[PDB]
């Protein structure tokens, strides 16, 4: 199976800096990736499906792309409601394995 790994496992970023998150896929998938966002005690929404399309109401802030063995999500202007858990999940291999979660928070005073 594809065992997921997030390299930036914890990233503290200023309120609007165009932050960069990533994962690597341990096997070879063409563009079979979806990005997920789980908020604090909330339902984990999809962000990106097919690694290049924004599904429904997903803004132009999210410019996630990547292929093969390196995948990257770009968050642009960083409202404080984006301080959440970012997953990446493949489409190709049964059983489906989610990402380990990227903990993104915004530093305050």
């Amino acid at each position: 199976e594809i065992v997921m790994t997030q390299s930036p496992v914890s990233l503290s970023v200023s309120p609007g800096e165009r932050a960069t998150l990533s994962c690597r896929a341990s096997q070879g998938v063409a563009s079979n990736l979806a990005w997920y966002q789980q908020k604090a005690g909330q339902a984990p929404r999809l962000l990106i499906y097919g690694a290049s399309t924004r599904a429904t109401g997903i803004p132009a802030r999210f410019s996630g792309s990547g292929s093969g063995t390196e995948f990257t999500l770009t968050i642009s202007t960083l409202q404080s409601e984006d301080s959440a858990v970012y997953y990446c999940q493949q489409y190709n291999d049964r059983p489906r394995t989610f990402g380990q979660g990227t903990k993104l928070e915004i530093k305050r005073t």
Partner: peptide, 17 residues
Amino acid sequence: YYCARDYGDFYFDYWGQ
């Protein structure tokens, strides 16, 4: 435990609480 509506067997479209 979450009940999550799928797009077949590709991806989780919607979730519960």
